[PDB]
Design a binder for this molecule. Structure first.
Ligand SMILES: *[B]([O])([O])[C]([N]C(=O)[C]1[C][C][C]N1C(=O)[C]([C])[N]C(=O)OC([C])([C])[C])[C]([C])[C]
Length: 198
């Protein structure tokens, strides 16, 4: 499969999440995603085929994971934006007030701005701390997907937020959305990964 930020993948033939970013760990290919999407060794499938397994994750506390892929996967430095693509150029962290977009299998590519950093989400499973908050909308299924600036600086992966009864926060004003992402920097250093760029 071609690995691109934002696309759908399933875990153990049950849950759906979105790919965050293609990365490598020495000769191993992989992608970063949300830790709540799977447990270590869960099987990831893309378009019905097995592409790899969860190699490590932390959730709750943090919300991060990486999936190691088979050699036959093609890693690409890109995030989906409809039929088009945003090129991944690096991981400079943007500041509060910067504009950012996110991509995932449920609401597609949505943009907004970063409104706060170091937020704690109190999930049923336990608190997740240190998340960055943006106001781009999102929905169930977007978890694990990419958060990137138009300039190509990868920011983090979708963790969670205030979904409404219709499964997303797109029907409420940006001023009322809380869409939280796990910062990418700590995930790359915690697992020794390098981002694929173009
Ligand atoms: B994702 O799996 O596609 C999904 N994320 C998701 O449901 C996460 C994982 C644990 C719970 N959670 C939430 O967003 C919870 C539902 N939201 C929540 O607690 O909002 C607060 C504002 C109260 C933190 C998808 C990204 C929505």
């Amino acid at each position: 499969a071609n690995i691109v930020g934002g696309i759908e993948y399933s875990i153990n033939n049950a849950s759906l999440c979105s790919v965050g970013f293609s990365v490598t760990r020495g000769a191993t290919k992989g992608f970063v995603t949300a830790g709540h999407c799977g447990t270590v060794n869960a099987t990831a499938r893309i378009g019905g085929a097995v592409v790899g397994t969860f190699a490590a994750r932390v959730f709750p506390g943090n919300d991060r994971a990486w999936v190691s892929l088979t050699s036959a996967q093609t890693l690409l430095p890109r995030v989906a934006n409809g039929s088009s693509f945003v090129t991944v150029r690096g991981s400079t962290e943007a500041a509060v007030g910067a504009a950012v977009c996110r991509s995932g299998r449920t609401t597609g590519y949505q943009c907004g701005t970063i409104t706060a950093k170091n937020v704690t989400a109190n999930y049923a499973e336990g608190a997740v701390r240190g998340l960055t908050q943006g106001n781009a909308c999102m929905g169930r299924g977007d978890s694990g997907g990419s958060w990137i600036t138009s300039a190509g600086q990868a920011q983090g992966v979708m963790s969670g937020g205030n979904v409404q009864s219709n499964g997303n926060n797109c029907g409420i004003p940006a001023s009322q959305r809380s869409s939280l992402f796990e910062r990418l920097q700590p995930i790359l250093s915690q697992y020794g990964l390098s981002l694929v760029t173009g």
